[PDB]
CSV table of C-alpha atoms and ligand atoms in Angstrom, one decimal:
chain,number,residue,atom,x,y,z
A,1,UNK,CA,-35.5,-42.8,-113.3
A,2,UNK,CA,-35.6,-39.1,-112.3
A,3,UNK,CA,-32.8,-38.5,-109.7
A,4,UNK,CA,-33.1,-36.8,-106.2
A,5,UNK,CA,-30.5,-35.1,-104.5
A,6,UNK,CA,-29.7,-36.2,-100.7
A,7,UNK,CA,-27.4,-34.9,-98.2
A,8,UNK,CA,-25.0,-37.5,-96.3
A,9,UNK,CA,-24.4,-36.4,-92.8
A,10,UNK,CA,-20.6,-35.5,-91.9
A,11,UNK,CA,-19.6,-36.4,-95.6
A,12,UNK,CA,-18.3,-33.3,-96.3
A,13,UNK,CA,-16.7,-32.9,-92.6
A,14,UNK,CA,-15.1,-36.2,-93.2
A,15,UNK,CA,-13.8,-35.3,-97.0
A,16,UNK,CA,-12.6,-32.0,-95.4
A,17,UNK,CA,-10.7,-34.0,-92.8
A,18,UNK,CA,-8.7,-36.5,-95.9
A,19,UNK,CA,-5.0,-35.1,-95.7
A,20,UNK,CA,-4.1,-33.5,-99.1
A,21,UNK,CA,-7.3,-32.2,-99.0
A,22,UNK,CA,-7.1,-28.2,-99.1
A,23,UNK,CA,-11.0,-27.4,-99.7
A,24,UNK,CA,-14.0,-29.3,-100.8
A,25,UNK,CA,-17.0,-27.2,-102.8
A,26,UNK,CA,-20.1,-28.7,-105.5
A,27,UNK,CA,-20.5,-31.5,-103.2
A,28,UNK,CA,-23.4,-33.7,-105.0
A,29,UNK,CA,-25.3,-36.8,-103.7
A,30,UNK,CA,-27.6,-38.3,-106.0
A,31,UNK,CA,-30.2,-41.3,-105.5
A,32,UNK,CA,-30.9,-43.2,-108.6
A,33,UNK,CA,-33.8,-45.6,-109.1
A,34,UNK,CA,-33.1,-49.2,-107.6
A,35,UNK,CA,-31.0,-48.1,-104.3
A,36,UNK,CA,-27.9,-46.9,-106.5
A,37,UNK,CA,-26.1,-43.9,-104.9
A,38,UNK,CA,-23.9,-41.4,-106.8
A,39,UNK,CA,-21.7,-39.0,-105.6
A,40,UNK,CA,-19.5,-35.7,-107.3
A,41,UNK,CA,-17.5,-33.1,-105.8
A,42,UNK,CA,-14.9,-30.7,-106.5
A,43,UNK,CA,-11.6,-30.7,-104.2
A,44,UNK,CA,-8.7,-28.8,-104.1
A,45,UNK,CA,-5.2,-30.0,-103.6
A,46,UNK,CA,-1.6,-29.1,-104.2
A,47,UNK,CA,-1.1,-30.2,-107.6
A,48,UNK,CA,-1.8,-33.4,-110.0
A,49,UNK,CA,0.5,-35.2,-108.3
A,50,UNK,CA,-1.2,-35.0,-104.8
A,51,UNK,CA,-4.1,-35.7,-106.6
A,52,UNK,CA,-2.9,-39.3,-107.3
A,53,UNK,CA,-1.8,-39.7,-103.7
A,54,UNK,CA,-5.3,-38.7,-102.3
A,55,UNK,CA,-7.5,-40.0,-104.7
A,56,UNK,CA,-8.0,-43.4,-103.1
A,57,UNK,CA,-8.5,-42.1,-99.9
A,58,UNK,CA,-11.2,-40.0,-101.1
A,59,UNK,CA,-12.7,-42.9,-102.9
A,60,UNK,CA,-12.4,-44.6,-99.8
A,61,UNK,CA,-14.6,-41.9,-97.7
A,62,UNK,CA,-17.3,-41.9,-100.1
A,63,UNK,CA,-16.9,-46.1,-99.9
A,64,UNK,CA,-17.4,-45.8,-95.9
A,65,UNK,CA,-21.1,-44.4,-96.7
A,66,UNK,CA,-21.8,-47.0,-99.6
A,67,UNK,CA,-21.0,-45.0,-102.3
A,68,UNK,CA,-19.1,-46.7,-105.3
A,69,UNK,CA,-19.4,-44.6,-108.1
A,70,UNK,CA,-17.8,-40.9,-107.8
A,71,UNK,CA,-16.6,-38.4,-109.8
A,72,UNK,CA,-13.9,-36.2,-108.5
A,73,UNK,CA,-12.8,-32.8,-110.1
A,74,UNK,CA,-9.3,-31.9,-108.4
A,75,UNK,CA,-8.6,-28.4,-108.5
A,76,UNK,CA,-4.7,-27.2,-108.1
A,77,UNK,CA,-2.9,-24.4,-105.8
A,78,UNK,CA,-1.7,-21.6,-108.0
A,79,UNK,CA,1.9,-20.1,-106.6
B,5,UNK,CA,-32.0,-34.5,-126.5
B,6,UNK,CA,-28.2,-33.2,-126.6
B,7,UNK,CA,-25.3,-34.2,-128.9
B,8,UNK,CA,-23.7,-36.5,-126.9
B,9,UNK,CA,-22.5,-38.8,-129.9
B,10,UNK,CA,-20.3,-35.4,-131.6
B,11,UNK,CA,-19.7,-34.4,-128.2
B,12,UNK,CA,-17.8,-37.6,-127.0
B,13,UNK,CA,-15.8,-37.4,-130.6
B,14,UNK,CA,-14.7,-33.9,-129.5
B,15,UNK,CA,-14.1,-34.8,-126.2
B,16,UNK,CA,-12.0,-38.2,-127.6
B,17,UNK,CA,-10.3,-35.7,-129.9
B,18,UNK,CA,-8.5,-33.5,-127.3
B,19,UNK,CA,-4.6,-33.8,-127.1
B,20,UNK,CA,-3.7,-35.8,-124.1
B,21,UNK,CA,-7.1,-37.7,-123.8
B,22,UNK,CA,-6.5,-41.4,-124.0
B,23,UNK,CA,-9.9,-42.6,-123.2
B,24,UNK,CA,-13.3,-40.9,-121.9
B,25,UNK,CA,-15.6,-43.4,-119.8
B,26,UNK,CA,-18.7,-42.0,-117.3
B,27,UNK,CA,-19.8,-39.2,-119.6
B,28,UNK,CA,-23.0,-38.2,-118.0
B,29,UNK,CA,-25.0,-34.8,-119.3
B,30,UNK,CA,-28.0,-33.7,-117.4
B,31,UNK,CA,-30.7,-31.6,-117.4
B,32,UNK,CA,-32.9,-32.8,-114.6
B,33,UNK,CA,-33.3,-29.0,-113.3
B,34,UNK,CA,-36.5,-26.8,-114.7
B,35,UNK,CA,-33.0,-25.9,-116.6
B,36,UNK,CA,-29.3,-25.7,-116.1
B,37,UNK,CA,-27.2,-28.6,-118.2
B,38,UNK,CA,-24.6,-30.4,-116.1
B,39,UNK,CA,-21.7,-32.5,-117.6
B,40,UNK,CA,-19.4,-35.2,-115.6
B,41,UNK,CA,-16.9,-37.6,-117.3
B,42,UNK,CA,-13.7,-39.3,-116.6
B,43,UNK,CA,-10.8,-38.6,-118.7
B,44,UNK,CA,-7.5,-41.0,-118.7
B,45,UNK,CA,-4.2,-39.7,-119.2
B,46,UNK,CA,-0.9,-40.5,-119.6
B,47,UNK,CA,0.6,-38.5,-116.7
B,48,UNK,CA,-0.2,-35.0,-115.2
B,49,UNK,CA,2.0,-33.0,-117.8
B,50,UNK,CA,0.1,-30.4,-119.5
B,51,UNK,CA,-2.8,-31.3,-117.2
B,52,UNK,CA,-3.8,-28.2,-116.6
B,53,UNK,CA,-3.8,-27.4,-120.3
B,54,UNK,CA,-6.0,-30.8,-121.3
B,55,UNK,CA,-8.5,-29.9,-118.6
B,56,UNK,CA,-9.2,-26.7,-120.0
B,57,UNK,CA,-9.5,-27.9,-123.6
B,58,UNK,CA,-12.2,-30.2,-122.2
B,59,UNK,CA,-14.0,-27.6,-120.7
B,60,UNK,CA,-14.0,-25.6,-123.8
B,61,UNK,CA,-15.3,-28.5,-125.6
B,62,UNK,CA,-18.3,-28.6,-123.1
B,63,UNK,CA,-18.9,-24.9,-123.3
B,64,UNK,CA,-19.0,-24.8,-126.9
B,65,UNK,CA,-21.5,-27.3,-126.8
B,66,UNK,CA,-23.5,-25.0,-124.2
B,67,UNK,CA,-22.9,-27.2,-121.1
B,68,UNK,CA,-21.0,-24.6,-118.4
B,69,UNK,CA,-21.2,-26.6,-115.2
B,70,UNK,CA,-18.6,-29.8,-115.5
B,71,UNK,CA,-16.9,-31.9,-113.3
B,72,UNK,CA,-14.0,-33.9,-114.8
B,73,UNK,CA,-12.2,-36.5,-113.0
B,74,UNK,CA,-8.5,-37.3,-114.6
B,75,UNK,CA,-7.3,-40.6,-114.3
B,76,UNK,CA,-3.4,-41.1,-114.6
B,77,UNK,CA,-1.5,-44.0,-116.2
B,78,UNK,CA,2.0,-42.3,-114.5
B,79,UNK,CA,3.7,-39.8,-112.8
C,5,UNK,CA,4.4,-31.6,-84.5
C,6,UNK,CA,2.2,-30.0,-82.1
C,7,UNK,CA,-1.2,-28.6,-82.5
C,8,UNK,CA,-1.9,-24.9,-81.4
C,9,UNK,CA,-5.6,-24.7,-80.7
C,10,UNK,CA,-7.1,-21.4,-82.6
C,11,UNK,CA,-4.1,-20.8,-84.6
C,12,UNK,CA,-5.6,-21.5,-87.7
C,13,UNK,CA,-8.6,-19.6,-86.9
C,14,UNK,CA,-6.6,-16.3,-86.2
C,15,UNK,CA,-5.0,-17.0,-89.6
C,16,UNK,CA,-8.1,-17.6,-91.3
C,17,UNK,CA,-9.2,-14.3,-89.3
C,18,UNK,CA,-6.5,-11.9,-90.9
C,19,UNK,CA,-8.0,-9.2,-93.6
C,20,UNK,CA,-6.7,-10.3,-96.8
C,21,UNK,CA,-6.1,-14.1,-95.8
C,22,UNK,CA,-8.1,-16.1,-98.5
C,23,UNK,CA,-7.3,-19.4,-97.4
C,24,UNK,CA,-4.9,-21.7,-95.0
C,25,UNK,CA,-4.0,-25.0,-96.0
C,26,UNK,CA,-1.0,-27.1,-95.0
C,27,UNK,CA,-0.4,-25.8,-91.5
C,28,UNK,CA,2.5,-27.6,-89.4
C,29,UNK,CA,3.7,-26.8,-86.2
C,30,UNK,CA,6.6,-28.5,-85.1
C,31,UNK,CA,8.6,-28.8,-81.8
C,32,UNK,CA,12.3,-29.0,-82.2
C,33,UNK,CA,14.2,-30.2,-79.3
C,34,UNK,CA,11.8,-29.3,-76.2
C,35,UNK,CA,12.0,-25.8,-76.8
C,36,UNK,CA,12.2,-24.0,-80.2
C,37,UNK,CA,8.8,-23.9,-82.1
C,38,UNK,CA,8.7,-23.6,-86.0
C,39,UNK,CA,5.8,-23.2,-88.4
C,40,UNK,CA,4.6,-23.5,-91.8
C,41,UNK,CA,1.5,-22.7,-93.8
C,42,UNK,CA,0.3,-21.9,-97.5
C,43,UNK,CA,-1.6,-18.7,-97.4
C,44,UNK,CA,-3.8,-17.8,-100.4
C,45,UNK,CA,-4.0,-14.0,-101.3
C,46,UNK,CA,-5.3,-11.9,-103.9
C,47,UNK,CA,-2.3,-11.4,-105.7
C,48,UNK,CA,1.7,-10.6,-104.7
C,49,UNK,CA,1.1,-7.1,-103.6
C,50,UNK,CA,-1.8,-7.9,-101.1
C,51,UNK,CA,0.5,-10.9,-99.7
C,52,UNK,CA,3.5,-8.2,-99.1
C,53,UNK,CA,1.2,-6.2,-97.0
C,54,UNK,CA,-0.5,-8.5,-94.9
C,55,UNK,CA,3.0,-10.7,-94.4
C,56,UNK,CA,3.5,-8.7,-90.9
C,57,UNK,CA,-0.1,-9.4,-89.7
C,58,UNK,CA,0.6,-13.0,-90.3
C,59,UNK,CA,3.8,-13.0,-88.7
C,60,UNK,CA,2.2,-11.2,-85.8
C,61,UNK,CA,-0.2,-13.9,-85.6
C,62,UNK,CA,2.1,-16.3,-84.8
C,63,UNK,CA,4.2,-14.5,-82.7
C,64,UNK,CA,1.1,-14.4,-80.6
C,65,UNK,CA,1.5,-18.0,-80.2
C,66,UNK,CA,5.4,-17.3,-79.2
C,67,UNK,CA,6.3,-18.5,-82.8
C,68,UNK,CA,9.3,-16.7,-84.5
C,69,UNK,CA,10.4,-19.2,-86.8
C,70,UNK,CA,8.1,-19.6,-90.1
C,71,UNK,CA,8.1,-20.7,-93.6
C,72,UNK,CA,5.0,-19.4,-95.5
C,73,UNK,CA,4.1,-20.4,-98.9
C,74,UNK,CA,2.0,-17.7,-100.5
C,75,UNK,CA,-0.6,-18.6,-103.3
C,76,UNK,CA,-2.4,-16.3,-105.3
C,77,UNK,CA,-6.0,-15.7,-106.9
C,78,UNK,CA,-4.7,-13.4,-109.4
C,79,UNK,CA,-1.6,-11.5,-111.1
D,5,UNK,CA,16.4,-42.4,-96.2
D,6,UNK,CA,17.3,-39.2,-98.1
D,7,UNK,CA,20.5,-36.8,-97.7
D,8,UNK,CA,19.9,-33.3,-96.8
D,9,UNK,CA,23.5,-32.5,-97.3
D,10,UNK,CA,23.4,-33.3,-101.1
D,11,UNK,CA,19.5,-32.2,-101.4
D,12,UNK,CA,20.8,-28.6,-100.3
D,13,UNK,CA,23.7,-28.9,-102.6
D,14,UNK,CA,21.3,-29.9,-105.6
D,15,UNK,CA,19.0,-27.0,-104.4
D,16,UNK,CA,21.6,-24.5,-104.3
D,17,UNK,CA,22.7,-25.8,-107.9
D,18,UNK,CA,19.5,-24.7,-109.5
D,19,UNK,CA,20.1,-21.7,-112.1
D,20,UNK,CA,18.5,-18.5,-110.2
D,21,UNK,CA,18.8,-19.7,-106.8
D,22,UNK,CA,20.7,-17.2,-104.7
D,23,UNK,CA,20.5,-19.1,-101.4
D,24,UNK,CA,18.6,-21.9,-99.6
D,25,UNK,CA,18.2,-21.5,-95.9
D,26,UNK,CA,15.8,-23.1,-93.1
D,27,UNK,CA,15.6,-26.3,-95.3
D,28,UNK,CA,13.5,-29.1,-93.3
D,29,UNK,CA,12.9,-32.8,-94.2
D,30,UNK,CA,10.3,-34.3,-91.9
D,31,UNK,CA,9.0,-37.7,-91.7
D,32,UNK,CA,5.4,-38.0,-90.7
D,33,UNK,CA,3.7,-41.5,-89.8
D,34,UNK,CA,2.8,-43.6,-92.4
D,35,UNK,CA,5.8,-42.7,-95.0
D,36,UNK,CA,4.7,-39.2,-96.0
D,37,UNK,CA,7.9,-36.9,-96.3
D,38,UNK,CA,7.3,-33.1,-96.2
D,39,UNK,CA,9.8,-30.7,-96.8
D,40,UNK,CA,10.4,-26.6,-96.3
D,41,UNK,CA,12.9,-24.3,-97.1
D,42,UNK,CA,13.5,-20.5,-97.8
D,43,UNK,CA,15.0,-19.9,-101.2
D,44,UNK,CA,16.4,-16.5,-102.4
D,45,UNK,CA,16.3,-15.1,-105.9
D,46,UNK,CA,17.0,-11.8,-107.5
D,47,UNK,CA,13.2,-11.3,-108.1
D,48,UNK,CA,9.6,-12.7,-108.2
D,49,UNK,CA,9.8,-13.2,-112.0
D,50,UNK,CA,13.3,-15.3,-111.3
D,51,UNK,CA,11.2,-17.2,-108.7
D,52,UNK,CA,8.5,-18.3,-111.2
D,53,UNK,CA,11.4,-19.7,-113.6
D,54,UNK,CA,12.9,-21.6,-110.9
D,55,UNK,CA,9.7,-23.0,-109.1
D,56,UNK,CA,9.1,-25.7,-111.1
D,57,UNK,CA,13.2,-26.8,-111.0
D,58,UNK,CA,13.0,-26.9,-107.3
D,59,UNK,CA,10.0,-29.0,-107.3
D,60,UNK,CA,11.4,-31.2,-109.3
D,61,UNK,CA,14.6,-31.6,-107.1
D,62,UNK,CA,12.5,-32.2,-104.2
D,63,UNK,CA,10.3,-34.9,-106.4
D,64,UNK,CA,13.4,-36.7,-107.3
D,65,UNK,CA,14.1,-37.5,-103.6
D,66,UNK,CA,10.7,-39.0,-103.3
D,67,UNK,CA,9.4,-35.5,-101.7
D,68,UNK,CA,5.9,-34.9,-102.7
D,69,UNK,CA,4.7,-32.2,-100.3
D,70,UNK,CA,6.4,-29.1,-99.9
D,71,UNK,CA,6.4,-25.7,-98.3
D,72,UNK,CA,8.5,-22.6,-100.2
D,73,UNK,CA,9.2,-19.2,-99.2
D,74,UNK,CA,10.7,-17.3,-101.7
D,75,UNK,CA,13.0,-14.4,-100.9
D,76,UNK,CA,13.9,-11.6,-103.2
D,77,UNK,CA,16.8,-9.0,-103.9
E,2,UNK,CA,-17.8,6.1,-88.9
E,3,UNK,CA,-18.8,2.8,-90.9
E,4,UNK,CA,-18.5,-0.6,-89.6
E,5,UNK,CA,-18.1,-4.2,-91.0
E,6,UNK,CA,-20.7,-6.5,-89.8
E,7,UNK,CA,-20.8,-10.2,-89.6
E,8,UNK,CA,-24.2,-11.7,-91.1
E,9,UNK,CA,-24.3,-15.1,-89.9
E,10,UNK,CA,-24.5,-18.2,-92.4
E,11,UNK,CA,-24.0,-15.5,-95.2
E,12,UNK,CA,-21.1,-17.0,-96.6
E,13,UNK,CA,-21.9,-20.2,-96.5
E,14,UNK,CA,-25.4,-19.5,-98.2
E,15,UNK,CA,-23.1,-17.9,-101.0
E,16,UNK,CA,-20.8,-20.8,-101.3
E,17,UNK,CA,-24.0,-23.1,-101.3
E,18,UNK,CA,-25.3,-21.5,-104.3
E,19,UNK,CA,-25.0,-23.8,-107.8
E,20,UNK,CA,-22.3,-23.0,-110.0
E,21,UNK,CA,-20.1,-20.8,-107.5
E,22,UNK,CA,-16.8,-22.5,-107.1
E,23,UNK,CA,-15.3,-20.2,-104.7
E,24,UNK,CA,-16.4,-16.9,-102.7
E,25,UNK,CA,-13.5,-14.8,-101.1
E,26,UNK,CA,-13.1,-11.2,-100.0
E,27,UNK,CA,-16.9,-10.9,-98.7
E,28,UNK,CA,-17.5,-7.4,-96.7
E,29,UNK,CA,-20.4,-6.3,-95.1
E,30,UNK,CA,-20.9,-2.9,-94.0
E,31,UNK,CA,-23.4,-1.2,-92.0
E,32,UNK,CA,-23.5,2.6,-93.3
E,33,UNK,CA,-25.4,5.7,-91.0
E,34,UNK,CA,-29.3,5.3,-91.4
E,35,UNK,CA,-29.4,1.5,-91.5
E,36,UNK,CA,-28.2,1.1,-94.7
E,37,UNK,CA,-26.3,-2.4,-95.2
E,38,UNK,CA,-23.9,-2.9,-98.3
E,39,UNK,CA,-21.7,-6.0,-99.4
E,40,UNK,CA,-19.0,-6.6,-101.2
E,41,UNK,CA,-17.6,-10.1,-102.8
E,42,UNK,CA,-15.2,-11.6,-105.2
E,43,UNK,CA,-17.2,-15.0,-106.8
E,44,UNK,CA,-15.3,-17.4,-109.0
E,45,UNK,CA,-17.5,-19.4,-111.7
E,46,UNK,CA,-16.8,-21.8,-114.3
E,47,UNK,CA,-17.0,-19.1,-117.1
E,48,UNK,CA,-18.9,-16.0,-117.7
E,49,UNK,CA,-22.1,-17.9,-119.1
E,50,UNK,CA,-22.2,-19.8,-115.7
E,51,UNK,CA,-21.9,-16.5,-113.8
E,52,UNK,CA,-24.9,-14.7,-115.9
E,53,UNK,CA,-27.1,-17.5,-114.5
E,54,UNK,CA,-25.8,-17.5,-111.0
E,55,UNK,CA,-25.8,-14.0,-110.3
E,56,UNK,CA,-29.3,-14.0,-109.9
E,57,UNK,CA,-29.3,-16.2,-107.3
E,58,UNK,CA,-26.6,-14.4,-105.5
E,59,UNK,CA,-28.4,-11.4,-105.7
E,60,UNK,CA,-31.1,-13.1,-104.0
E,61,UNK,CA,-29.0,-14.4,-101.1
E,62,UNK,CA,-28.0,-11.1,-100.4
E,63,UNK,CA,-31.5,-9.6,-100.6
E,64,UNK,CA,-32.9,-12.5,-98.0
E,65,UNK,CA,-30.7,-10.6,-95.3
E,66,UNK,CA,-32.3,-7.5,-96.6
E,67,UNK,CA,-29.3,-6.1,-98.9
E,68,UNK,CA,-29.9,-4.3,-101.8
E,69,UNK,CA,-26.5,-2.8,-102.9
E,70,UNK,CA,-23.7,-5.2,-103.8
E,71,UNK,CA,-20.5,-5.0,-105.9
E,72,UNK,CA,-19.7,-8.3,-106.9
E,73,UNK,CA,-16.4,-9.2,-108.5
E,74,UNK,CA,-16.7,-12.4,-110.6
E,75,UNK,CA,-13.5,-14.2,-111.4
E,76,UNK,CA,-13.6,-17.0,-113.9
E,77,UNK,CA,-12.1,-20.5,-114.5
E,78,UNK,CA,-12.5,-20.1,-118.2
E,79,UNK,CA,-12.8,-17.1,-120.6
E,80,UNK,CA,-15.3,-19.5,-122.6
F,6,UNK,CA,-6.3,10.2,-101.4
F,7,UNK,CA,-8.2,11.9,-104.1
F,8,UNK,CA,-10.9,10.5,-105.3
F,9,UNK,CA,-11.5,13.3,-108.1
F,10,UNK,CA,-8.4,12.3,-109.6
F,11,UNK,CA,-8.7,8.8,-109.4
F,12,UNK,CA,-12.2,8.8,-111.0
F,13,UNK,CA,-10.7,10.9,-113.7
F,14,UNK,CA,-7.9,8.2,-114.3
F,15,UNK,CA,-10.3,5.3,-114.1
F,16,UNK,CA,-12.5,7.1,-116.8
F,17,UNK,CA,-9.6,7.4,-118.4
F,18,UNK,CA,-8.6,3.7,-118.9
F,19,UNK,CA,-9.1,2.2,-122.2
F,20,UNK,CA,-12.3,-0.2,-122.6
F,21,UNK,CA,-13.7,1.6,-119.6
F,22,UNK,CA,-16.8,2.8,-121.2
F,23,UNK,CA,-18.5,4.3,-117.6
F,24,UNK,CA,-18.1,4.1,-113.8
F,25,UNK,CA,-20.4,4.5,-111.2
F,26,UNK,CA,-20.3,3.5,-107.2
F,27,UNK,CA,-16.7,4.3,-106.0
F,28,UNK,CA,-16.0,3.9,-103.1
F,29,UNK,CA,-12.7,4.0,-101.1
F,30,UNK,CA,-12.7,2.9,-97.4
F,31,UNK,CA,-10.2,2.9,-94.4
F,32,UNK,CA,-10.3,-0.1,-92.7
F,33,UNK,CA,-8.6,-0.5,-89.3
F,34,UNK,CA,-5.0,-1.2,-89.2
F,35,UNK,CA,-4.0,1.1,-92.5
F,36,UNK,CA,-5.8,-1.0,-94.9
F,37,UNK,CA,-7.5,0.8,-97.9
F,38,UNK,CA,-10.1,-0.8,-100.0
F,39,UNK,CA,-11.7,0.2,-103.0
F,40,UNK,CA,-15.1,-0.8,-105.0
F,41,UNK,CA,-16.3,0.4,-108.0
F,42,UNK,CA,-19.0,-0.7,-111.1
F,43,UNK,CA,-17.5,-0.5,-114.6
F,44,UNK,CA,-19.0,-0.7,-117.7
F,45,UNK,CA,-17.4,-2.4,-120.4
F,46,UNK,CA,-17.8,-4.1,-123.9
F,47,UNK,CA,-17.5,-7.7,-122.9
F,48,UNK,CA,-15.9,-10.6,-120.7
F,49,UNK,CA,-12.8,-10.6,-123.0
F,50,UNK,CA,-12.5,-6.9,-122.9
F,51,UNK,CA,-12.8,-6.6,-119.2
F,52,UNK,CA,-10.1,-9.5,-118.5
F,53,UNK,CA,-7.7,-7.1,-120.7
F,54,UNK,CA,-8.9,-3.9,-118.4
F,55,UNK,CA,-8.6,-5.6,-115.1
F,56,UNK,CA,-5.0,-5.2,-114.8
F,57,UNK,CA,-4.7,-1.7,-115.7
F,58,UNK,CA,-7.6,-1.0,-113.3
F,59,UNK,CA,-6.1,-2.5,-110.4
F,60,UNK,CA,-2.8,-0.8,-111.3
F,61,UNK,CA,-4.3,2.7,-111.3
F,62,UNK,CA,-5.4,1.8,-107.9
F,63,UNK,CA,-2.2,0.6,-106.8
F,64,UNK,CA,-0.5,3.9,-108.1
F,65,UNK,CA,-3.0,5.6,-105.1
F,66,UNK,CA,-1.7,2.8,-102.6
F,67,UNK,CA,-5.0,1.1,-102.8
F,68,UNK,CA,-4.1,-2.8,-102.9
F,69,UNK,CA,-7.5,-4.4,-102.5
F,70,UNK,CA,-10.4,-4.1,-104.8
F,71,UNK,CA,-13.7,-5.2,-106.1
F,72,UNK,CA,-14.6,-4.2,-109.1
F,73,UNK,CA,-17.8,-5.1,-110.8
F,74,UNK,CA,-17.9,-5.3,-114.6
F,75,UNK,CA,-21.2,-4.3,-116.2
F,76,UNK,CA,-21.4,-5.5,-120.1
G,101,LIG,ZN1,-13.1,-44.0,-114.2
G,102,LIG,ZN1,-0.7,-25.0,-100.8
G,103,LIG,ZN1,14.4,-16.8,-94.5
G,104,LIG,ZN1,-15.1,-26.2,-108.5
G,105,LIG,ZN1,-10.6,-12.4,-105.9
G,106,LIG,ZN1,-36.2,-5.4,-101.1
G,107,LIG,ZN1,-24.1,-0.8,-111.1
């Protein structure tokens, strides 16, 4: 039941590559017992509206690595 | 052992918060308590303000690393 | 829309520039190249100081017409 | 799709906006519309006040991604 | 005649510290007689998180032989 | 610039309990940077005095600063 943090190749690159994603930090990928991988990340975006637009794309990036449960914290640009 | 019961009540209590799910509070490390949650809100208006309040709630419970995913109905 | 190699690297390399995003370079009819970017600095004062350097970076690539949105850590 | 001419009028019409130039609206592939503009105000303080309104003006025209260069007197 | 250096990976290692939300304005200077000093701005969730991560950051610098640092903390929240 | 007057003005700022490790550097292309460690009551006081400190430096033409608070 004790989770172990793994390091998926290219994941952060693909995330940084998503249109609308201005920066990525605090990416964590965990192996829960019984094969279930989850991930969290903080993502910088222009504003709340842009986040709504890119949330799906981000989730797809994770889904491409077989990851179905994510928690993404958006942080927003500050003029 | 945390006080998850009280924590989730206070989180549900924050103005702008319509619903809270996928709350996880971890202290797996030799130390450092982390928390994640998903939070439903009507729309992005005052999101900055509601994010801050949520973060405060966690801080008041000694939780200082958090990742909060908002889900918005509208806007 | 073009892709100028090294441009974003050179921009990120300018002293006082904390971050660059949303860089876009356009070719208007077969001649006039325009560029737009968001640029993070410490604060408004730092931005004023580095604006000329940033403009030079663009100028070194033949770009004379820019639209720059400054974003700030502080102030 | 949109109307640049009406858009610029609405932008110039925002209280505190002293001048709008270099307004461009781009259609990127896959439906994504971007807009850039230079906008003059009296000073930084006035700009902060009108920034939100400007963003709304763009939003009202279905434009979600903007780059705005403020200029001052 | 002091000069800026670029220690490889340093900003990566700093950004990699758990609880670091952002690093900017990193400067590493070579002072005469071999003495390397460093400055940085480091963003954290709040004061409490910063106290926890300050030691780790100091270690990161120490691993590169750097003993004298001036680190400006920036917080998402005061509290 | 004048380090001596600068340090006086900094020590003079309300909330600043002590100042050490003040350095002012000239980077190429005219850009002056300054760093300092400052003793202050607590995080809240620091937020209040950060702006004042920044102003003090700005008054001397210094636009980029790194200030390390010690509480
Ligand atoms: Zn959810
Ligand atoms: Zn931006
Ligand atoms: Zn202009
Ligand atoms: Zn973050
Ligand atoms: Zn900073
Ligand atoms: Zn040592
Ligand atoms: Zn000290």
